[PDB]
Enzyme design. Structure first.
Site, PDB file in Angstrom:
ATOM      1  N   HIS A   6      33.822 -16.758  35.484  1.00  0.00           N
ATOM      2  CA  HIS A   6      34.746 -16.404  34.432  1.00  0.00           C
ATOM      3  C   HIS A   6      36.114 -17.098  34.540  1.00  0.00           C
ATOM      4  O   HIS A   6      36.886 -16.841  35.458  1.00  0.00           O
ATOM      5  CB  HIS A   6      34.874 -14.860  34.385  1.00  0.00           C
ATOM      6  N   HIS A  53      25.379  -9.524  30.829  1.00  0.00           N
ATOM      7  CA  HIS A  53      25.386  -9.026  32.215  1.00  0.00           C
ATOM      8  C   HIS A  53      24.674  -7.703  32.410  1.00  0.00           C
ATOM      9  O   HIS A  53      25.262  -6.647  32.338  1.00  0.00           O
ATOM     10  CB  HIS A  53      26.761  -8.685  32.779  1.00  0.00           C
ATOM     11  N   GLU A 111      23.194  -5.865  37.689  1.00  0.00           N
ATOM     12  CA  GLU A 111      24.408  -5.582  38.494  1.00  0.00           C
ATOM     13  C   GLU A 111      24.608  -4.127  38.978  1.00  0.00           C
ATOM     14  O   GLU A 111      23.845  -3.677  39.805  1.00  0.00           O
ATOM     15  CB  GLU A 111      25.637  -6.198  37.775  1.00  0.00           C
ATOM     16  N   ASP A 137      30.982 -16.370  39.731  1.00  0.00           N
ATOM     17  CA  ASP A 137      31.490 -15.196  39.036  1.00  0.00           C
ATOM     18  C   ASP A 137      33.002 -15.046  39.003  1.00  0.00           C
ATOM     19  O   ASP A 137      33.640 -15.269  37.991  1.00  0.00           O
ATOM     20  CB  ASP A 137      30.754 -13.998  39.619  1.00  0.00           C
TER      21      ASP A 137
HETATM   22  O1  LIG Z   1      35.566 -12.856  31.554  1.00  0.00           O
HETATM   23  C1  LIG Z   1      35.156 -11.702  30.667  1.00  0.00           C
HETATM   24  C2  LIG Z   1      35.177 -10.491  31.568  1.00  0.00           C
HETATM   25  O2  LIG Z   1      34.291 -10.611  32.623  1.00  0.00           O
HETATM   26  C3  LIG Z   1      34.425  -9.461  33.425  1.00  0.00           C
HETATM   27  N1  LIG Z   1      33.672  -9.744  34.666  1.00  0.00           N
HETATM   28  C4  LIG Z   1      33.643 -10.874  35.400  1.00  0.00           C
HETATM   29  N2  LIG Z   1      32.602 -10.945  36.269  1.00  0.00           N
HETATM   30  C5  LIG Z   1      32.013  -9.786  36.115  1.00  0.00           C
HETATM   31  C6  LIG Z   1      32.660  -9.055  35.145  1.00  0.00           C
HETATM   32  N3  LIG Z   1      32.221  -7.760  34.764  1.00  0.00           N
HETATM   33  C7  LIG Z   1      31.052  -7.429  35.325  1.00  0.00           C
HETATM   34  N4  LIG Z   1      30.257  -8.375  36.016  1.00  0.00           N
HETATM   35  C8  LIG Z   1      30.884  -9.304  36.892  1.00  0.00           C
HETATM   36  O3  LIG Z   1      29.910 -10.384  36.908  1.00  0.00           O
HETATM   37  C9  LIG Z   1      35.937  -9.209  33.358  1.00  0.00           C
HETATM   38  O4  LIG Z   1      36.178  -7.983  32.540  1.00  0.00           O
HETATM   39  C10 LIG Z   1      36.423 -10.278  32.365  1.00  0.00           C
HETATM   40  O5  LIG Z   1      37.395  -9.905  31.344  1.00  0.00           O
HETATM   41 ZN   LIG Z   2      30.487 -11.734  35.767  1.00  0.00          ZN
END
Ligand SMILES: OC[C@H]1O[C@@H](n2c[nH+]c3c2N=CN[C@H]3O)[C@H](O)[C@@H]1O
Ligand SMILES: [Zn+2]
Length: 349
Positions: A14, A211, A214, A292
């Site tokens: 991200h 997603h 998880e 991630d």
């Molecule tokens: O980049 C979009 C959003 O990804 C979310 N993020 C990033 N990695 C993760 C996650 N939320 C859950 N999964 C993890 O893999 C954050 O809220 C961010 O705003």
């Molecule tokens: Zn993520």
């Protein structure tokens, strides 16, 4: 040690949390935004994590720093630039970045984030920044960037929007819609706004991912594959619970996006029980190792790959083949994908 040294592929990352302490730091102390720290390490040492926390917690670490960056127009293109940077420094030829227009503003946005204030900045622009910043960064680092635009679980109102974003920025630079944010919000992955926007996606071409998995139950994945239509699963760990669902994705041939070091750290893992990642390797299901959030976890793509050959023993012989799969699953025309396949293929091999 290397630990994988041929030219990688990466699908899950991200923007959001691929910023360096420095560009935060700048902008906090530049348009003024009273920040949470000072020494560039202390910033790190509030922002990032080391004891395994919980997914909810992970997700508000973010509230620490974002104000800094949010709209300022400036920063959008700069942290998009410096992000392509990191992606050619640790080993990558090809990346899909994801992000959330909605977090990145300013104007419109009736739940206005962090919380912050009105407003030049729009969804429509906070993308066309990034596309330049990943077009530039491409230009100047050797790495091709396509992005992914993220609907966001807790706000369905906005999801609708992202599909229009994707459709029309489609290839300059965006190849996809995602869903992201807290798995724990009961019901989220089904709410009307989401399914509506995914299905304007399938109604209109747009590649999909979610997603799911998880830190929530196998159901959330079953919803994602069957109701939302997810073309590839963003994490998919808990699909090893419904073990007939599990044989059905192994069978459909579909991408699990693993995030090793991420798994221990959010909550998706108990360190007493073999991580889903080694399993996918035994079963040989198309997975991809992945980053991630570089910043929030204090890490690099070498960190995953090294959590994985030394704890959970991984041949190079595997690494080879997952980095072929990730390429195979990419959201990129068969055009661009024969020839990114010609790359790692005549170089692994
Ligand atoms: O980049 C979009 C959003 O990804 C979310 N993020 C990033 N990695 C993760 C996650 N939320 C859950 N999964 C993890 O893999 C954050 O809220 C961010 O705003
Ligand atoms: Zn993520």
């Amino acid at each position: 040690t290397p630990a994988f040294d041929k030219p990688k592929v990466e699908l899950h990352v991200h923007l959001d949390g691929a910023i360096k302490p420095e560009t935060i730091l700048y902008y906090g102390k530049r348009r003024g935004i009273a920040l949470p720290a000072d020494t560039p390490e202390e910033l790190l040492n509030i922002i990032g994590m080391d004891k395994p926390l919980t997914l909810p917690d992970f997700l508000a670490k973010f509230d620490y720093y974002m104000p800094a960056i949010a709209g300022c127009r400036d920063a959008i293109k700069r942290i998009a630039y410096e992000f392509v940077e990191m992606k050619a420094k640790d080993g990558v030829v090809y990346v899909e970045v994801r992000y959330s227009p909605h977090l990145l503003a300013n104007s419109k946005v009736e739940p206005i984030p962090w919380n912050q204030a009105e407003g030049d900045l729009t969804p429509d622009e906070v993308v066309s920044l990034v596309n330049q910043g990943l077009q530039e960064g491409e230009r100047d680092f050797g790495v091709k960037v396509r992005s992914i635009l993220c609907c966001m679980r807790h706000q369905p109102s906005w999801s609708s929007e992202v599909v229009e974003l994707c459709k029309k920025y489609r290839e300059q630079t965006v190849v996809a819609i995602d869903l992201a944010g807290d798995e724990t919000i009961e019901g989220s992955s089904l709410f009307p706004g989401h399914v509506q926007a995914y299905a304007e996606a399938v109604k209109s071409g747009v590649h999909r991912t979610v997603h799911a998995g998880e830190v929530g139950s196998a159901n959330v994945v079953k919803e994602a594959v069957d109701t939302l239509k997810t073309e590839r699963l963003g994490h998919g760990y808990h699909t090893l619970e419904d073990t007939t669902l599990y044989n059905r994705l192994r069978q459909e041939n579909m991408h699990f996006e693993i995030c090793p070091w991420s798994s221990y750290l959010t909550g998706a893992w108990k360190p007493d029980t073999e991580h889903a990642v080694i399993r996918f390797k035994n079963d040989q299901v198309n997975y991809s190792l992945n980053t991630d959030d570089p910043l929030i976890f204090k890490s690099t793509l070498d960190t995953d790959y090294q959590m994985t050959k030394k704890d959970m023993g991984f041949t190079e012989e595997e690494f080879k083949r997952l980095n072929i799969n990730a390429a195979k699953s990419s959201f990129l025309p068969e055009d661009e994908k024969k020839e990114l396949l010609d790359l790692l293929y005549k170089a692994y091999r």
